[PDB]
Each structure stands twice: as C-alpha cells, then as structure tokens.
Amino acid sequence: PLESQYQVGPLLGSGGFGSVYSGIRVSDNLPVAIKHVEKDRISDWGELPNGTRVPMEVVLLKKVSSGFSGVIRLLDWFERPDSFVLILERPEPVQDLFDFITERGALQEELARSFFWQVLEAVRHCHNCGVLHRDIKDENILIDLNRGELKLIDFGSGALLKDTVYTDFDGTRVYSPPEWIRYHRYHGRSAAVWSLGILLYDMVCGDIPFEHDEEIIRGQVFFRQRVSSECQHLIRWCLALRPSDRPTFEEIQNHPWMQDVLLPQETAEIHLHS
Numbered sequence: 001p002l003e004s005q006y007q008v009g010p011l012l013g014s015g016g017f018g019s020v021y022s023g024i025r026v027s028d029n030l031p032v033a034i035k036h037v038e039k040d041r042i043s044d045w046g047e048l049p050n051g052t053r054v055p056m057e058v059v060l061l062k063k064v065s066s067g068f069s070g071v072i073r074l075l076d077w078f079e080r081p082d083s084f085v086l087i088l089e090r091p092e093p094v095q096d097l098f099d100f101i102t103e104r105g106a107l108q109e110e111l112a113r114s115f116f117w118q119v120l121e122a123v124r125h126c127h128n129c130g131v132l133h134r135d136i137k138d139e140n141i142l143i144d145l146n147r148g149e150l151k152l153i154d155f156g157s158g159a160l161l162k163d164t165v166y167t168d169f170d171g172t173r174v175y176s177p178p179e180w181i182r183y184h185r186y187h188g189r190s191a192a193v194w195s196l197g198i199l200l201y202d203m204v205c206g207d208i209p210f211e212h213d214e215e216i217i218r219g220q221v222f223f224r225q226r227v228s229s230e231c232q233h234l235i236r237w238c239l240a241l242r243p244s245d246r247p248t249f250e251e252i253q254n255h256p257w258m259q260d261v262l263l264p265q266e267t268a269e270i271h272l273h274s
C-alpha cells in the first residue's frame with residue numbers, strides 16, 4: 001500500500017472539486033492521474049458493494065470501470081485523514097475538448113460527428129451501468145490524440161441512474177435543462193440529451209448556445225457558423241423545451257446526420273495529424 005507505487009508529476013488542473021496531478025505508476029511505468037478530493041467538499045457520499053462509506057464519485061467510477069475505453073477507468077483509490085486520492089488512467093498525449101475547441105474553433109462536421117458518436121457511446125455505457133454523469137461538456141472529455149479516442153471524465157456530480165425525478169443538481173448551469181432552471185426538477189435521460197444538444201452545438205459553433213437563464217428557458221438556437229441543415233435539425237431536437245419531445249440515445253444515433261461515422265483511428269489520421 002502507501003504512496004510508494006506512484007510518482008507525482010506536475011499538477012494538471014484544480015478548482016473547488018480539487019487538484020489533479022500527472023503521475024507514473026512505478027510498479028510498471030503506466031501513466032496515471034492522481035486526483036485529490038477534500039472530504040469537506042464532498043456533499044454526496046455513497047457506499048460500496050463491499051459496504052464502506054466513500055464519495056459517490058468512487059461508487060460511480062467502480063460501476064463504470066472495465067473493458068470499454070470510452071470512460072476513464074479508476075485503477076485504485078486511497079483514504080486520508082482529510083481527502084480521498086483517486087488513481088485513474090492517463091493517455092499520452094492527451095488534450096481536453098475545451099482546449100481543443102479553444103485552439104481550432106468550430107470543428108468540421110465530419111470531426112464533430114466522430115466526436116459526438118463517441119460521447120454518445122460513452123454515455124450509453126454509463127447509463128447501462130446504472131450511472132448518470134450529469135455534467136457532460138467539453139471540459140469533461142479527454143481526447144487521446146494518438147488513437148483519436150475520447151474519454152469521459154469526472155463523475156463528481158454524477159448520481160445513480162433512476163426513473164424517478166431528480167430534485168438536486170450540482171453540475172454546470174449553462175448546460176442544464178430548462179426544466180431545471182424553472183422547476184428545479186429533471187429526469188436523467190432527457191436532461192443528459194439536453195447537455196448533449198449543447199455539447200454538439202459547442203463542437204460545431206466553437207462555443208455554447210446560451211449564456212443566461214432566459215436564453216435557456218426560451219430555447220431558441222441561433223447559429224453563428226455554417227452548419228448543415230441536418231446537424232441543425234439534431235441540435236434543435238436535443239434542445240426541445242419539453243423533455244418528452246427530446247430524442248432517445250437510439251434516436252440520436254439513427255439520426256441521418258449521425259451516419260457513416262469515421263473510426264477513432266481514421267479520425268486521428270485525418271484530423272489530429274497522427
């Protein structure tokens with residue numbers, strides 16, 4: 001045990017959630033990320049199959065970790081007197097979708113579609129595992145620039161998935177649905193689809209559609225860049241004001257604009273200059 005097996009590199013980011021450092025498992029040189037979370041800043045606790053009292057993030061991480069590389073896997077975790085320390089995988093080289101959009105602006109449709117699909121495949125995986133992320137957005141998506149594979153990260157506002165209503169949200173406002181904004185209630189799926197509508201608008205317009213509460217409640221989408229009619233259709237569908245007017249994952253993934261997606265490898269070859 002102990003803090004022997006890992007070697008702490010540079011800090012990767014921080015905030016009110018905590019601090020993440022680059023790290024190398026000594027045990028065999030694998031890249032990892034070392035995420036330190038303060039007990040005081042966890043509002044949502046959970047408990048394991050094993051039955052111990054851990055942050056919800058750790059519960060959800062365990063339920064989603066396994067073969068499929070569309071979600072970042074949690075390799076191990078530790079407890080400390082005032083924090084939990086999480087060890088997760090780290091692709092090399094890697095960059096987050098937010099930075100990648102800051103650099104390259106609006107993405108070519110073909111690139112967006114391959115990115116969007118992959119997010120769709122990640123979120124479907126979480127939904128199967130009984131996990132709801134609740135904070136899907138460019139900053140919670142890592143690109144592995146060599147293999148062209150997106151990895152969803154940061155379950156710190158997630159919850160167990162359920163069919164009843166959610167009356168709490170501790171995620172990103174500008175990505176939250178209008179039913180949350182007015183009534184303080186949403187349902188998982190439909191609120192996830194809204195965040196995906198936002199995410200796709202982001203990808204294709206270089207930036208997010210709404211900044212203020214009223215623009216959210218109004219739900220009218222102005223396009224600032226050339227975007228095909230079919231992409232515009234899908235975005236507006238995901239951003240239906242009534243939750244039940246929103247598409248299901250299956251309906252999103254059968255949308256005409258979602259056809260003939262590139263593979264992750266082809267994607268890096270053509271767009272990440274692999």
Ligand SMILES: CN(C)Cc1nc2c(sc3ccc(/C=C/C4CC4)cc32)c(=O)[nH]1
Pocket residue numbers: 012013017020033035072088089090091094095096139140142153154155
């Ligand atoms: C997404 N934020 C709030 C923090 C956060 N970062 C990571 C995780 S796993 C993880 C794994 C790798 C890397 C490497 C990133 C490069 C772009 C700087 C970061 C993270 C998380 O769970 N939370």
